[PDB]
Structure formats: structure tokens, C-alpha cells
Design an enzyme around this catalytic site. Structure first.
Site, short mmCIF file in Angstrom:
data_model
loop_
_atom_site.label_atom_id
_atom_site.label_comp_id
_atom_site.label_asym_id
_atom_site.label_seq_id
_atom_site.Cartn_x
_atom_site.Cartn_y
_atom_site.Cartn_z
N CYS A 186 -35.90 7.93 0.50
CA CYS A 186 -35.83 7.24 -0.27
C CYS A 186 -35.37 7.82 -1.83
CB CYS A 186 -37.05 6.39 -0.27
SG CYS A 186 -38.20 7.21 0.30
N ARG A 194 -41.50 4.93 1.54
CA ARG A 194 -40.73 4.19 2.57
C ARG A 194 -40.22 5.51 3.37
NH1 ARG A 194 -36.67 1.14 -1.03
NH2 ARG A 194 -38.29 0.61 -2.77
N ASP A 252 -37.96 -4.75 -4.13
CA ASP A 252 -38.53 -3.80 -5.69
C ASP A 252 -39.65 -3.42 -6.57
OD1 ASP A 252 -35.76 -3.40 -6.42
OD2 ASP A 252 -36.49 -4.25 -8.70
#
Ligand SMILES: Cc1sc2ncnc(N(C)C)c2c1C
Length: 281
Positions: A214, A220, A180
């Protein structure tokens, strides 16, 4: 050599400084189609837009717009479509794009929920017997099989064009363990995931470009196609240490803004490439 450049930046703690020079040097191209008022609900984030020159166009006469970019790495002979996680109203457009671009793989680097908010619509079926029909784009999607592993899930999907009754097999690669906050401590499971996507044939020139996403399709997603391209260039070049990760990132940023969102993602990208490289040498 980057390994030495890595220790230099790390020992000096200069990651935030390197990252800012990349921000400064990055290309800026118009994104007029993204900003049209009729496209406002096709964008998850108002500050993340495809450039007009590299945007993927849908083959529908009404509105051709999707938040997606083609990243063409000429020397590596690799293409990627980077896109946002679909919205409730764009799940049909997402699968239309997969169909029209002849993609064989979808790479998903987020969970549907992170930090207690929805990062993405649930755009694939959860059970074999409960298929999804996208009425707006005339496509049917069926889950064929699901292989759940510790760090990732691979799903076989059948996409059917209801208009022509053609069917194609799509592989969904879902990296499920990106934290996260921040980045993974080790790039080991990320690199295994990368070689799994490669082994599938999804990155090969006999298919359309892989779809990578993402939530925004820049952070990412950026790390994924930066590591792949850098490792491929090291295989191809007479001198593997001629590969400058900062230069490759800037070349990729000509095609979509903001690839690699934080100095931590940049550090992680170096670590991934270094480890992967050493996994040859
Ligand atoms: C980081 C990984 S995973 C993996 N699986 C199969 N082959 C590989 N090589 C040696 C190309 C790799 C590498 C370098």
C-alpha cells in the site's frame, strides 16, 4: 471459534482494547540498516522500517537497501514480500527486487493519489506503446494488457533484463476501491480480489514471493496476507477452529512491524476470514 469471539468483542466494543494488547505483545527487532543516513531518501515514512533480520537485500554492491520485508509463514507454506509504495527515486529498485526474487505477481492496495496527496510513484506504464526504462537498474517494463473491472484492475506486464535480454511476465493486481477513510463495509469484493490473485498462481511455491504494497506496506498489505494465511491454515488443519487470528498476526509481526494499523483493520480482518471460511462451510 472466532465467529463467537467476534460477537463478544463487537457487543462489548473491545476492538481498541484487543488492538492495544497486540501492539504491547508485538516483537521489536533492530532496524539499523534502515536508519543509516545514506538510506534516508529510500524510506517513505521515518517510523516504518524493515527489521534487519527479514529485510530484502538488492544484489547491487553499492547499496543493497530497499524498504521491504520477507514474511515467511512456515506452517502455511506461504511467503510474501511487503514493501512501501515506491518513491520517484526507488522505482528502479522496486523492479530490481521483483526481478531478483522471481516474483510472478505484484498486489497494490492503494490509489496513486488518496486524500489529495501522492501515496505512490506511478511505477508501471499507462499505455502499450509507451514502455518504461529504469536506467539505474537496466530493466525495461512494457504494458501488454489491462483488464479494468469494477473493484480491481489486472495488468499483464513484461519485465526485460536489458543486461541478459531475459523477459518475464508479471501480473499486477490493483485493488482500486479501498476507501480513503476506514475499511470497506463488506469484505465481499476484497475476498473475490484475494481468490483472483490465488487463481493466477502468483501465491504458489513454484514462484518467488508475491510483492504486496500500500503506501507504507503495513496496514492494508497486512490485512491481505493475514486473510490469505488464516484461510490456508483452515484448509490444512484437522481442526479449522484452532486458527487464532491474533496469534497469526503476532507471528507475522516478527517479520515486519505494525502490520494492521488500526482496530478497524483488525475487525475487517476477522470479518474477511469469517466470511471466507463460511464460503467453504
Ligand atoms: C471468499 C471466496 S472467493 C472464491 N472463489 C473461488 N473459490 C472459493 N473457495 C470456495 C475456496 C472462493 C472463496 C472461499
Amino acid at each position: 471459534e472466532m465467529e463467537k469471539e467476534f460477537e463478544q468483542i463487537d457487543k462489548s466494543g473491545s476492538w481498541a482494547a484487543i488492538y492495544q494488547d497486540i501492539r504491547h505483545e508485538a516483537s521489536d527487532f533492530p532496524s539499523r540498516v534502515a536508519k543509516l543516513p545514506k538510506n534516508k531518501n529510500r524510506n517513505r515514512y521515518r517510523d516504518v522500517s524493515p527489521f534487519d533480520h527479514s529485510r530484502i537485500k538488492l544484489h547491487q554492491e553499492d547499496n543493497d537497501y530497499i524498504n521491504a520485508s520477507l514474511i515467511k509463514m512456515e506452517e502455511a507454506q506461504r511467503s510474501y514480500i511487503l514493501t512501501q509504495g515506491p518513491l520517484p527515486n526507488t522505482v528502479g529498485h522496486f523492479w530490481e527486487m521483483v526481478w531478483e526474487q522471481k516474483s510472478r505477481g505484484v498486489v497494490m492496495l492503494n490509489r496513486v493519489m488518496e486524500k489529495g496527496s501522492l501515496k505512490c510513484a506511478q511505477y508501471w506504464p499507462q499505455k502499450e506503446e509507451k514502455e518504461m526504462i529504469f536506467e539505474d537498474t537496466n530493466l525495461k517494463l512494457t504494458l501488454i494488457s489491462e483488464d479494468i473491472k469494477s473493484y480491481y484492475t489486472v495488468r499483464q506486464l513484461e519485465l526485460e533484463n536489458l543486461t541478459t535480454q531475459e523477459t518475464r511476465e508479471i501480473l499486477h493486481f490493483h485493488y482500486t476501491t479501498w476507501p480513503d477513510f476506514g475499511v470497506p463495509e463488506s469484505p465481499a469484493s476484497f475476498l473475490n480480489f484475494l481468490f483472483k490473485v490465488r487463481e493466477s498462481g502468483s501465491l504458489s511455491p513454484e514462484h518467488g514471493p508475491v510483492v504486496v504494497h500500500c503506501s507504507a506496506g503495513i496496514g492494508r498489505s497486512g490485512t491481505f496476507c493475514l486473510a490469505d494465511t488464516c484461510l490456508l491454515l483452515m484448509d490444512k488443519r484437522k481442526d479449522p477452529s484452532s486458527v487464532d487470528i491474533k496469534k497469526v498476526l503476532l507471528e507475522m509481526r516478527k517479520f515486519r512491524m505494525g502490520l494492521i494499523q488500526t482496530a478497524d483493520q483488525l475487525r475487517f480482518s476477522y470479518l474477511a476470514v469469517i466470511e471466507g471460511a463460511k464460503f467453504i462451510m
